[PDB]
Every structure is written in C-alpha cells, then in structure tokens.
Amino acid sequence: AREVILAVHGMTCSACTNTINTQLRALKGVTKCDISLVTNECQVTYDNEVTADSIKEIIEDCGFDCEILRDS
Ligand SMILES: [Cu+2]
Numbered sequence: 684a685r686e687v688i689l690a691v692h693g694m695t696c697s698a699c700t701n702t703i704n705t706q707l708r709a710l711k712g713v714t715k716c717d718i719s720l721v722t723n724e725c726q727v728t729y730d731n732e733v734t735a736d737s738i739k740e741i742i743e744d745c746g747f748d749c750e751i752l753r754d755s
Pocket of ligand 1: 699
C-alpha cells in the first residue's frame, strides 16, 4: 500500500466530501481515506487492486473535477 493525493475541485461542503470519502471506503483496495476541504485534495491509502486511476474516476463521477496530483 501507499497514499495518493487527488487534487479535487468543485466540492465545497460536508455532504460532498462525506459522499466522496464514503465512496473511496466502498471500492476494494482502499485501506484509509482522509478528505480535506482545506487543501482541496482527497488523500486515499490504496494497496494495488484499486489505484488513483479508478479513484479519480469515482471522485469525478461523484460530480466534480479532480486529478491525481501526486503520491501522498
Ligand atoms: Cu457540496
């Protein structure tokens, strides 16, 4: 496992960030998941089965604009 940062834009509320971290929690290969309305990134700890690639997509689908900014 490792951490990845998704820089995440659009979301600005508890409902959205809750919705986000909730989804990350419910993928497969996600160990930990800590979102921040301060930095406007989502930090997620993944193993292998799920990557920043899928995570990006999940996080986009939630209804916002994000990208894999960097590992951790
Ligand atoms: Cu919102």
